[PDB]
Scaffold this active site. Structure first.
Site, short mmCIF file in Angstrom:
data_model
loop_
_atom_site.label_atom_id
_atom_site.label_comp_id
_atom_site.label_asym_id
_atom_site.label_seq_id
_atom_site.Cartn_x
_atom_site.Cartn_y
_atom_site.Cartn_z
N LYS B 44 0.78 -1.22 0.00
CA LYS B 44 0.00 0.00 0.00
C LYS B 44 0.83 1.29 0.00
O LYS B 44 0.35 2.37 -0.37
CB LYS B 44 -0.89 0.01 1.25
CG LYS B 44 -1.86 -1.15 1.30
CD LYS B 44 -2.65 -1.09 2.60
CE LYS B 44 -3.64 -2.24 2.70
NZ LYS B 44 -3.00 -3.51 3.14
N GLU B 93 8.32 2.64 -5.11
CA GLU B 93 8.26 2.19 -3.72
C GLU B 93 8.37 3.38 -2.78
O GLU B 93 8.86 4.47 -3.15
CB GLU B 93 9.38 1.14 -3.50
CG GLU B 93 9.47 0.36 -2.21
CD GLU B 93 8.18 -0.35 -1.80
OE1 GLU B 93 8.18 -1.59 -1.60
OE2 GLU B 93 7.20 0.38 -1.64
N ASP B 94 7.88 3.19 -1.53
CA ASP B 94 8.03 4.23 -0.52
C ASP B 94 9.32 4.11 0.29
O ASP B 94 9.94 5.14 0.58
CB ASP B 94 6.83 4.31 0.45
CG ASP B 94 6.53 3.02 1.16
OD1 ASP B 94 7.09 1.93 0.87
OD2 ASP B 94 5.65 3.13 2.07
N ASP B 97 14.25 -1.10 2.98
CA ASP B 97 14.82 -1.25 4.32
C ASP B 97 15.74 -2.47 4.29
O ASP B 97 16.93 -2.34 4.00
CB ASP B 97 13.69 -1.37 5.35
CG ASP B 97 14.16 -1.14 6.77
OD1 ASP B 97 15.28 -1.61 7.10
OD2 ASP B 97 13.43 -0.48 7.57
N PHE B 146 12.31 3.89 12.87
CA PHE B 146 11.01 3.63 12.24
C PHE B 146 10.34 4.95 11.89
O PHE B 146 10.07 5.76 12.77
CB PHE B 146 10.14 2.81 13.17
CG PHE B 146 8.91 2.26 12.51
CD1 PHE B 146 8.99 1.14 11.73
CD2 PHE B 146 7.68 2.87 12.68
CE1 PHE B 146 7.87 0.63 11.11
CE2 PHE B 146 6.56 2.35 12.06
CZ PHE B 146 6.66 1.25 11.29
N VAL B 147 10.07 5.17 10.60
CA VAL B 147 9.44 6.40 10.15
C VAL B 147 8.02 6.09 9.67
O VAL B 147 7.66 4.95 9.35
CB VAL B 147 10.24 7.11 9.03
CG1 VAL B 147 11.61 7.52 9.57
CG2 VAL B 147 10.38 6.21 7.84
N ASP B 153 3.09 3.36 7.15
CA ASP B 153 2.14 3.18 8.24
C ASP B 153 2.78 2.69 9.54
O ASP B 153 3.82 2.02 9.54
CB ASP B 153 1.07 2.13 7.89
CG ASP B 153 1.64 0.73 7.78
OD1 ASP B 153 2.59 0.50 6.98
OD2 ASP B 153 1.16 -0.16 8.50
N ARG B 159 -0.49 6.76 7.19
CA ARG B 159 -0.07 6.83 5.80
C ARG B 159 -0.39 8.18 5.17
O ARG B 159 0.29 8.58 4.22
CB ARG B 159 -0.73 5.74 4.95
CG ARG B 159 -0.45 4.33 5.33
CD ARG B 159 -0.94 3.39 4.29
NE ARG B 159 -0.93 1.99 4.73
CZ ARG B 159 0.12 1.17 4.66
NH1 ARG B 159 1.28 1.58 4.15
NH2 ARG B 159 0.01 -0.06 5.11
O1 LIG Z 1 12.91 -3.58 2.23
P1 LIG Z 1 11.91 -4.32 3.12
O2 LIG Z 1 12.49 -4.74 4.44
O3 LIG Z 1 11.39 -5.44 2.31
O4 LIG Z 1 10.74 -3.24 3.61
C1 LIG Z 1 10.18 -2.39 2.65
C2 LIG Z 1 8.71 -2.74 2.48
O5 LIG Z 1 8.08 -2.86 3.67
C3 LIG Z 1 6.83 -1.82 3.69
O6 LIG Z 1 5.74 -2.43 3.18
P2 LIG Z 1 4.75 -3.34 4.17
O7 LIG Z 1 5.07 -4.81 3.99
O8 LIG Z 1 4.72 -2.76 5.51
O9 LIG Z 1 3.30 -3.18 3.41
P3 LIG Z 1 2.63 -1.70 3.20
O10 LIG Z 1 3.35 -1.02 2.03
O11 LIG Z 1 1.24 -2.09 2.72
O12 LIG Z 1 2.67 -0.97 4.47
C4 LIG Z 1 7.28 -0.84 2.85
O13 LIG Z 1 6.19 -0.07 2.22
C5 LIG Z 1 7.99 -1.56 1.70
O14 LIG Z 1 7.17 -2.09 0.72
N1 LIG Z 2 6.10 2.66 8.37
C1 LIG Z 2 7.30 1.98 8.10
N2 LIG Z 2 7.29 0.73 7.47
C2 LIG Z 2 8.56 0.05 7.18
C3 LIG Z 2 8.80 -1.12 6.58
C4 LIG Z 2 10.16 -1.32 6.56
N3 LIG Z 2 10.74 -0.25 7.16
C5 LIG Z 2 9.77 0.63 7.56
C6 LIG Z 2 9.79 1.97 8.26
O1 LIG Z 2 10.77 2.54 8.64
N4 LIG Z 2 8.53 2.63 8.50
MG LIG Z 3 5.09 -1.56 1.20
MG LIG Z 4 3.69 -1.16 6.23
#
Ligand SMILES: O=P(O)(O)OC[C@H]1O[C@H](OP(=O)(O)OP(=O)(O)O)[C@H](O)[C@@H]1O
Ligand SMILES: Nc1nc2cc[nH]c2c(=O)[nH]1
Ligand SMILES: [Mg+2]
Ligand SMILES: [Mg+2]
Ligand SMILES: O=P(O)(O)OC[C@H]1O[C@H](OP(=O)(O)OP(=O)(O)O)[C@H](O)[C@@H]1O
Ligand SMILES: Nc1nc2cc[nH]c2c(=O)[nH]1
Ligand SMILES: [Mg+2]
Ligand SMILES: [Mg+2]
Lengths: 173, 173
Positions: B44, B93-94, B97, B146-147, B153, B159
């Protein structure tokens, strides 16, 4: 500088949209100030409006997304990953034309026992209606023309225009 | 006016993001000026950045969306509705990590015979990496915390903040 050359007329400018989302966001924030609604974007077209509207909606909320296609038969391509049972649902859309898409979705969320269901749409084209469906919140009303931009595609292109416009004849070949 | 009271520090302001999407959009538009790429948003979290970035990307393109859930085992919740075969793919992507999510997706699109695969991410947290993965385009680098905001979220909330911030300790309680 290519897409602009395909556009005959800007119907709604980026500055107009920016003002309207600021206005609606504050009103919607007050409406939902005592609940954590689930805002549901109808992919693909709702994404630009939903992003910019909810950035201006200063309240706690959650998000999810659905994908649907469409004789009057509507098909779910992607369903929610969140239960709607007992939730206040806000459906976010880019345009309501015939009303078919949202008629389907509203009945689906009521069947699933949503506490309430409201709709916010960027654009409304009331001349297109084939079923009775009105949104609770509407950005702009548009005439009986095919528009593109700010989420709305022609053959999957033009969604990334930062305004709403009408295509030049030659684009339709 | 309540989410702001949960934020200890604004890490990246809305004005900073606006300037950076203007810059990246023009660069990316030039990169993709001779093709119609498929820009794929990772739901999302990618939705706010993808909307605002592609509004500033003045080139012909198509969009689609995927949903995944991360042991290192990644799950597709929603797959594409578009073939990637022979297409130039831009993943949006947002945050990156650990790198897990995007290492999975890049391999999937190469297996499906994409012509090219690039990544644009709003945020990059290089201290979080567990696998080697870098984006082609990065908005901002962030520290090891954690941001939330601008798509990101905490327990599905926050979000819709129009900036990126860090939560007050009490919120975790
Ligand atoms: O590099 P990584 O350790 O793989 O983390 C990055 C992913 O984790 C979060 O998504 P999340 O799974 O929380 O789903 P969301 O986007 O719906 O919040 C974030 O938006 C990225 O997609
Ligand atoms: N909201 C949020 N989600 C993720 C998922 C991986 N890293 C992060 C972070 O720093 N903040
Ligand atoms: Mg995500
Ligand atoms: Mg998430
Ligand atoms: O009121 P209706 O007559 O039902 O038309 C409105 C729907 O049609 C368009 O979606 P489309 O099916 O083109 O998918 P898209 O959002 O992915 O472009 C539009 O974004 C709305 O969702
Ligand atoms: N792009 C675009 N899609 C739809 C879908 C229904 N009406 C319209 C419209 O006017 N423009
Ligand atoms: Mg649609
Ligand atoms: Mg469409």
């Amino acid at each position: 500088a290519m897409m602009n050359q395909d556009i005959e007329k800007v119907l709604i400018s980026e500055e107009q949209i920016q003002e309207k989302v600021l206005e609606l966001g504050a009103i919607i924030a007050e409406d939902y100030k005592n609940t954590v609604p689930l805002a549901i974007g109808v992919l693909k077209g709702a994404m630009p409006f939903m992003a910019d509207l909810l950035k201006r909606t200063d309240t706690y909320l959650e998000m999810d997304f659905m994908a649907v296609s469409s004789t009057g038969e509507v098909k779910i391509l992607k369903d929610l990953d969140t239960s709607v049972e007992g939730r206040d649902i806000l459906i976010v859309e880019d345009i309501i034309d015939s009303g078919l898409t949202l008629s389907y979705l509203v009945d689906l969320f009521k069947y699933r026992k949503a506490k309430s269901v409201k709709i916010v749409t960027l654009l409304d084209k009331p001349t297109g209606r084939k079923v009775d469906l009105k949104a609770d919140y509407v950005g702009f009303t548009v005439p009986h023309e095919f528009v593109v931009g700010y989420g709305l595609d022609y053959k999957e292109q033009y969604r990334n225009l930062p305004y709403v416009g009408v295509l030049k004849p030659s684009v339709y070949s």
